[PDB]
Design a protein around this ligand. Structure first.
Ligand code: HEM
Ligand code: HEM
Ligand code: H4B
Ligand code: H4B
Ligand code: NRG
Ligand code: NRG
Ligand code: ZN
Lengths: 414, 416
């Protein structure tokens, strides 16, 4: 029942008892493991055909509230009971309820803390929670989003933050941010079928053009936002260039790298995920912290289905691109990651390398082992895309399981 | 649509459905509640020493299943021969309590087992395996002769050939044939006074177990351990490998002259010798196998793991890198060069080796082949993706479904 978890570098061992609190099922079954799959369809968050059994929501809600009060140690107090009564009251009459700002702040933090795929969870306690449930239009989301970006960026000294927009309402549309991240480079499919820019953003780039945006023709054209208000066609808003901080990329000892004119934005801000707290679902809650160098240098720039600049660089490095055994890929990958780290540090913008980052995650596991008796972690996502066993987490066994509050994936609006 | 795991490759955007997992008749460690897919040894395949023969009934189902597998592999499923072999196996379990495999059935099962290994990335070669039957073997001395012939044939003076040597299956009331060593060729780990370890820290226990058994220990970092071979109900005996049989490769770098000076070296033949080979229910406690190395096994795990040779620092210093700050990627840089050194050295020494790129590319080919032949392929992602340049290989972008198929290679408790 309670997993025996071992680290193979320190022979240490623990017993994950935190998974007992998991009330949602993953994709694995005793017959076959599907832990390496990216998406579900089973862990997904289907829209609202109607009101969910008052008993269900009520239960998720009762549990969350209990969490919040244990949180502030006032468990069993009067306020705790009066708060439960409240929630049961609202639900019984309207089929739903709402959260107090202090609970939202607690929930958002627990959601990050429970994020099995996040390696930066050691920062979970420090989170700036902008409340935007007081939003009635897309015009407004744009402003809120602009405030978040402005604050989170802080001229390079990045600060973690999340902005929570109106929870989903049964029998009503959903506030939604169509973009996958608040900031992403457009992908233009040029005749040859090939792509100019970011292949990952071909679709969202299309949709934008389809709603009026007049595209550009560059490799790094910052995409406009397509904010959607309940049951209304999305609206298009361009992001103020002064607002979008970017880091030109150059290399420490290789003068030519800069020539490549590669660049990347400073704010990683996933914006299409769903935040679920006490049964409530927040369809639009963008969050941001700061990049870990490999996300840009390894996946974004070297993925074959991304900017795939791996060969262009090896050529310049005068490498033997003829055979695999020359390790021209491994050699060029490390320089590109070095270049990202170097450039961000030079532009005085927050960034964390994969070594330092996984070290902090180890500490986090420790801190969490003591605090809750375990930590849900997705091994395949926690181990960096390069130098895996070269980091401490590669050698750490992990247990994956779903806990709430939680960030979950959700279907595309279109 | 389909009632089977939907699998996607995010690089090419292609989709496949795995129907082969429905053929697994043995649960793993996961549950809808939590996934334990990153655990190295969850108690599942594990075969705690059963006092006697499997439950008369249970052993029948397993056995009847393997036979079905054999006849279908030869396209004679449902034939007179197939049905008779079935009647035969049953009768033998009904009278003796166990049963034996015809030669061709053993070769078949062995290959299946490899073919089914979820953690092996070189399975594209599963059909090409030399199976030395050695079920006649009756002594620890005899065990030593077979093993030597294996290394002789498998090493083949540089041009390695995949092979496996199968010894007598577990018998009721009779001890097992066990090879105490983890691999046929291993370097000694000497426990020091100051607490450290000279050689390979992994092999410390087996090194101390050979000494207890009269081995006269040396004192270098790369000392080839002796073999602790054990026959049924006897205590193990010791045997030393003739240096001429154990091919070894000195490591040097293609452009860094000093690397050669480090005096680093590795043996060419990898041979897991402690795994259990299970076929049709029959358990072969000793059945060493070998193929050939993949660059990263040596250049990343053995040489750079903190709990192994841990040479990352020494090499980084020699390259004049900033080891006092992770953001310099001094670890990534040195690792790349150490791996390039293992590759270079083997090539230079006409010894078979495969790098992680070619290896994983060929595995993708293997997945496509199996998709067509069996409707899928059991794979352990954490083990398939190389320890360096992970997302730079095609396997990183390929989702995988892990499950247990038999024949199989299962981990087993140390004999001691
Ligand atoms: C403090 C800086 C942070 C760092 C360094 C960090 C780093 C990471 C990295 C490396 C990933 C994998 C991303 C990928 O490969 O696509 C990840 C995933 C994730 N992080 Fe964090 N994170 C940070 C802050 C945050 C914050 C502020 C939140 C929310 C409050 C958050 C929520 C998540 C979630 C939900 C995922 C998975 C998203 C997905 O499945 O696409 N992270 N994080
Ligand atoms: C000829 C080329 C071969 C290559 C390049 C190859 C490579 C590999 C690699 C990289 C691993 C993981 C090593 C580790 O992480 O410690 C592995 C594991 C394994 N291979 Fe292969 N393999 C080959 C041949 C064989 C043969 C001939 C057999 C058996 C007949 C086999 C059976 C297995 C099994 C059982 C495992 C898992 C062992 C464990 O759990 O530690 N392999 N192979
Ligand atoms: C197929 C496989 O699950 C997929 O490529 C995963 C692997 N590990 C990952 N790890 C992180 N951090 N991010 C990812 O997107 C992935 N992709
Ligand atoms: C803890 C974790 O499961 C462990 O370090 C695994 C990860 N992937 C691996 N992959 C291979 N090929 N070999 C290994 O020994 C491991 N070790
Ligand atoms: N670091 C974070 N990353 C979110 C995903 C970003 C994506 N890998 C990419 O654009 O490369 N989260 N965060 O810090 O909030
Ligand atoms: N390549 C193989 N490796 C088996 C494990 C070897 C181990 N990692 C090591 O010695 O580094 N098997 N094989 O090819 O038969
Ligand atoms: Zn699993």
């Amino acid at each position: 029942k309670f997993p025996r978890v071992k680290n193979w570098e320190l022979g240490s061992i623990t017993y994950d008892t935190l998974c007992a609190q998991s009330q949602q099922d993953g994709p694995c079954t005793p017959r076959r493991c599907l832990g390496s799959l990216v998406l579900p369809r089973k862990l997904q968050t289907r829209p609202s055909p109607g009101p969910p059994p008052a008993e269900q929501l009520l239960s998720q809600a009762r549990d969350f509230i209990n969490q919040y009060y244990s949180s502030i140690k006032r468990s069993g107090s009067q306020a705790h009971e009066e708060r439960l009564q409240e929630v049961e009251a609202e639900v019984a009459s309207t089929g739903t309820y709402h959260l107090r700002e202090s609970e939202l702040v607690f929930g958002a933090k627990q959601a990050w803390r429970n994020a099995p795929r996040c390696v930066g969870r050691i920062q979970w306690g420090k989170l700036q929670v902008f409340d935007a449930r007081d939003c009635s239009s897309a015009q407004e989301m744009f402003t809120y989003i602009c405030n978040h970006i402005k604050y989170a960026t802080n001229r390079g000294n990045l600060r973690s933050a999340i902005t929570v927009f109106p929870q989903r309402a049964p029998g009503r549309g959903d506030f939604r941010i169509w973009n996958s991240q608040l900031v992403r480079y457009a992908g233009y499919r040029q005749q040859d079928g090939s792509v100019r820019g970011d292949p990952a953003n071909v679709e969202i780039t299309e949709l934008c053009i389809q709603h009026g945006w007049t595209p550009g023709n560059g490799r790094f054209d910052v995409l406009p936002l397509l904010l959607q208000a309940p049951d209304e066609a999305p609206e298009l808003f361009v992001l103020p260039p002064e607002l979008v901080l970017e880091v030109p990329l150059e290399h420490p000892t290789l003068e030519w790298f800069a020539a490549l004119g590669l660049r990347w934005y400073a704010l990683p801000a996933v914006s299409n995920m769903l935040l679920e707290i006490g049964g409530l679902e927040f369809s639009a809650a963008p969050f941001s912290g700061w990049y870990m160098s490999t996300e840009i240098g390894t996946r974004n720039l070297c993925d074959p289905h991304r900017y795939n600049i791996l060969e262009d660089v090896a050529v310049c490095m005068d490498l033997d691109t003829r055979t695999t055994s020359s390790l021209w890929k491994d050699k060029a990958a490390v320089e590109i990651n070095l270049a990202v780290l170097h450039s961000f540090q030079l532009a005085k913008v927050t960034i964390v390398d994969h070594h330092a980052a996984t070290v902090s995650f180890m500490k986090h596991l420790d801190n969490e082992q003591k605090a809750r008796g375990g930590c849900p972690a997705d091994w395949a996502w926690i181990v960096p895309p390069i130098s895996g066993s070269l980091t401490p987490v590669f050698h750490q066994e992990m247990v994956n399981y779903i806990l709430s509050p939680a960030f979950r994936y959700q279907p595309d609006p279109w």
